Design a protein around this ligand. Structure first.
Ligand SMILES: *[C@@H]1O[C@H](CO)[C@@H](O)[C@H](O)[C@H]1NC(C)=O
Lengths: 47, 49
């Protein structure tokens, strides 16, 4: 599920005070075991 | 070619079905009929009846 909204002001303190409905985008039929989560970042070089 | 049917070569293909905890993926086709309107008809639309 995913959505996007703008905020203009950064204020890196807390999530915005607002309601939003999360619309589905895709469904996946493989039923493999999942127990842990890991994420990536885009870092190319010092620049 | 000169050998008999008993000694002739035969091509054999073996299929092996199995069931697991998977959500079922590889099964066969479902056929559909025409669509009728304005008549009292029992229907089966993709599992809803
Ligand atoms: C993970 O796989 C094992 C099989 O060793 C199974 O017993 C278990 O239900 C699966 N799921 C989780 C969340 O452990």
């Amino acid at each position: 599920y995913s959505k996007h909204t703008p905020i203009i002001v950064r204020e890196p303190e807390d999530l915005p005070q607002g309601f939003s409905a999360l619309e589905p985008l895709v469904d996946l039929p493989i039923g493999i075991n999942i127990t842990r989560f890991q994420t990536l970042l885009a870092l190319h070089r010092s620049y | 070619p000169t050998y008999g049917v008993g000694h002739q070569p035969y091509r054999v293909v073996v299929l092996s079905f199995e069931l697991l905890h998977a959500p079922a993926t590889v099964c066969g086709p479902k056929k559909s009929t025409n669509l009728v309107k304005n008549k009292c008809v029992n229907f089966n639309f993709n599992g809803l009846k």
